[model samples]
Target chain A: SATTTNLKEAIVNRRSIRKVTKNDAITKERIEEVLKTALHAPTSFNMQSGRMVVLMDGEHEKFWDIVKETLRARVPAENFEATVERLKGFHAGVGTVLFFEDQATVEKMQENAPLYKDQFPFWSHQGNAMLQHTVWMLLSAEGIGASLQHYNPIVDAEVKETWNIPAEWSLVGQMPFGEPNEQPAERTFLPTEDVVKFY
Target chain B: SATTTNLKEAIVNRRSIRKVTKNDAITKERIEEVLKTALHAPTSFNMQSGRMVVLMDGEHEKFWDIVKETLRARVPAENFEATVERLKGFHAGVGTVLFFEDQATVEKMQENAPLYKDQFPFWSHQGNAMLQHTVWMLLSAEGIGASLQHYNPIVDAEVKETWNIPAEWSLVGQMPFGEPNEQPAERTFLPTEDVVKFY
Candidate 1:
């Protein structure tokens, strides 16, 4: 479906939607369509180091299962139940998007431009964030609900092993997305004047 | 003028237009309108740590001058001329948006959630990138051209001293934007199948 929302509307309406369902309208083809647009987000030095792994259907459920078990092992037993409930919300989504930055590409750039060696890694993260934001807004405009998660580092090894991700691919963030099952509460912002200054 | 282009169009059309001019239509009021929407971008832990400084006209030119002098001192003398030429393109823009993260807020979050202490700083960068991307696309939709620049760390101290920016704010990225004076060449992407995978 074509996104009818304009850039401003998409920016304003997008939110961290947690409760979602696997609506029939949210098909793989539709997800691909959105990803195609998000891939255009700019990267520093044109490294294009961002990588994504989309988990859907049984695979989507499995990824959450891994997260639940992983958190269960670490979270105190007294709080394990609450953690499970939170994981369930993500599990309910139609699919998960795993955002990664290719260390190989970053390292290559560093080697070629040693003057910016320290900057390549951070720039990689910034580039990945650009991709994530693009995907989030585009998905929202398509009427899909999504939330950004960072169960990474802890789950990185397991996810990489399970998905056969390359050793150089470092996980940055996870996005669980589907059709909206509940409306998010209104968001509040700090005073715009406080955050932005004009000179 | 209202943005008639939809989200997909904005995403697809957003390019790093380097050569720009200060168009009469790109007034301070118009810049503020776009930033209002960008300020709504989500931040990790609702910290809202992202901060922006819009330097226009004389101030914008001063920022570029600092960048040029800073690079001249570091770059080889043989390459200094080329560097000055590149800096002129940015100086030509109507304004520059200096993207920063409030370290005080990020540090407070670290203290409050020590378990995730290591993440707050990186998350802050990611949040700032979201704000940058939002502003870039919105500006593109408004028929403005912009490019992301990173002259941070090198110019951080000078920028803060010149603009009287807060000590707690850390610079992340810079964006110089104005009316299009040159059309960017067609952008090429890596194979989508390589960067993105489906399960």
Candidate 2:
């Protein structure tokens, strides 16, 4: 379960991998290792609010079925085929990890620190992002590809109804991971000087 | 300056170091490396919206001065003395990285993807978290200590005014980093079964 890359290497090389192959199936043990790594992410005030629901392929057919059904109500008729294919891209992976925030923990913190009441929901996402990034980096270093997705609101209800998710766990984002099949498309960045400053 | 720890070790070992020593100062070159590594973090839709304002100690007195001044206005009179001491701890680090999200880019994304306009603000935080986490881990691996803070809204205005930050970049979070002083306080965790679920 050791990572192949260092922190710098992982940061520079990790990409949003979309197309992946099922030929190199990821093992249950490997996914669990990644999850364990993710659980180590730092949480503000040590709230440990980053929650996840991992759904692996084959055994997790219901999750994808729920996603497809959910998208049907939203995708335009003309773009339904393309949208459905895009949704199926999630299935190309060995699994999907649905990231959530424990609303109960967030609410308690907000009550405890009234000064930061407005900041807790956002802080929860900050903690969840660390979990997502940790899992993504470890998976990428282990030769797995993954992409972050926001199918929240769109698929939240069905996912909860199908998987029996807790009421207080608010969905933040989703990630699909597997053996990468294609490189990320040519991408450009906004200039660093424009975005980064020293004062 | 290469990272000595592998990704797994970095993820597992990375903790919020609130108290740092001034013995080993982080250099401009090292901070730049961490910032560059942070810019490589994957953003939603390649929006590349993560923005930062890095200020090093022994050079950027105004930033800390402003932070102290802002907290003075916000911290309650009874707790003011202790809170100022807490704020001063940020200066113990060799530098601070003020993390921001370009509201312009987020607005553009909202306009481009009208379907998820409501989700863009939250997504911006998620993307920014990756940036923050990347910088935090890379800094930790480089033998530097850091902690994340949410002094926004209160310190946001003065920070932008003092640093001449762009109007469109909204403050999200901040990190103060430098040589290690003491270890993170004893911590506890919510059981994995409580936060992470597998289907």
Candidate 3:
């Protein structure tokens, strides 16, 4: 209950504000600081087997465009319009959005030992994501809002091409940072004990 | 960069000092604060799913002795004596240790969503270990000497029996706390580029 207040503040106060005023832009320095905070996250051992992709510029548009179609391809055709409407300008007025992954991580583990051969993939990715999200919360500490999205396999392929990525990078998770588009009350949320605390 | 100073100091200054000649014994209150710090560590989807067992006084010695014998059983009989010699009084003069894990974590995740049943088992354990390590570092930050060990499943079983541990609790790591027997010398660590980087 002691640090819970601070932790909860980090949880409740931090929002992935998707709607920043166009005049206000995210700075490279801030993005760098967020990433810097992220790398400090603990990994299984010290492998640090995770990668982050910062999607910005035209590529952010490319991200939603590609993934929107993928959703359309999978979902009912009638749903496409509403979905596209929902996806409309996914990157509009957003700050630095970072995607995380682990391409060479499994292979690296395999080369080291066959005992758990790629047995640690989940740990690597989960560990990275956990650490990364804390950075997201830390962003809130800096007045930055963070929202996580996983269009896995949904946007994974096009994202690779759009970003000119290699095969080794495994896209695990993505988060959008911007000023809160709506107040925190507008979004879906759960309580700290509901989502957190020991079993 | 951002949180680098905190994380770097945690990593660099985390010493395994064993001598505690002049220090006061570690109080339960001190252990409680550090353990609480560990619980704040990020886990997959806020699935914290872990519990800790704290052993001081006679119980600590009982578990320590059990682990020593357990490791010896795994080693060759001829080499066992040397192993025992090496562990002789390793934690004899330490403060207190906090044991980790709660299988109830996996059960809770499954209850929350059966789909996540497969992934939570491993991730929960990884999170448990991560939390322990994080707390260990935080303990070090408080100038407490601590070391992590896996004498569980041996001495720990007896420990559980003594404590009447619930079926949900699973042993993850052992943390011995005390004053150091020797001052740890600093060492040069590998460069960040060698360990991690995003291209």
Query: Which numbered prediction scores highest in TM-score against the true structure?
Result: 1
Predicted structure 1, TM vs. truth: 0.97
iRMS value of model 2?
A: 1.6
Best-to-worst TM-score order: 1, 2, 3
Residue-level lDDT of model 2, residues A1-199, one tens digit each, is 3455777887777788887657445877778878887788888778888888888777455676777777778778897777778766677778888888889999999999898899888888888887888888888888888888787877787787778888888888888888897787777878778878876
Candidate 3's DockQ is 0.14
What is the lDDT, from 0 to 100, of the residue A92 in candidate 3?
Answer: 60
Candidate-wise lDDT, in order: 0.89, 0.80, 0.57
Share of reference contacts found in each model: 0.86, 0.89, 0.02
Clashes of each: 0, 0, 10
Model 1 lDDT tens row, B36-63: 9888888888899999999998899999
Model-by-model DockQ, in order: 0.81, 0.76, 0.14
- The residue-by-residue lDDT of candidate 3 on B73-134, one tens digit each, is 78898888886763544446444454445677677778787755665765676566556656
Index of the highest-lDDT prediction: 1
Candidate 1: CAPRI quality band: high
| Per-residue lDDT value at B126 in model 1 | 84
Give the alpha carbon lDDT tens digit for every residue of A8-95 in model 3.
Answer: 3443455554443222446655666656655655555456766666655455566766777788888887777886764543466454
**In candidate 1, which residue ranges exceed 4 Å CA deviation?**
none
Clashes of 2: 0
lDDT of 1 by residue, A1-199 (tens): 3367877788888888898888888889999988988998888888899999999989999999999999989999999998788777789999999999999999999999998899898888888988999899889888899999989899999999999999999999999999887788777888888998999
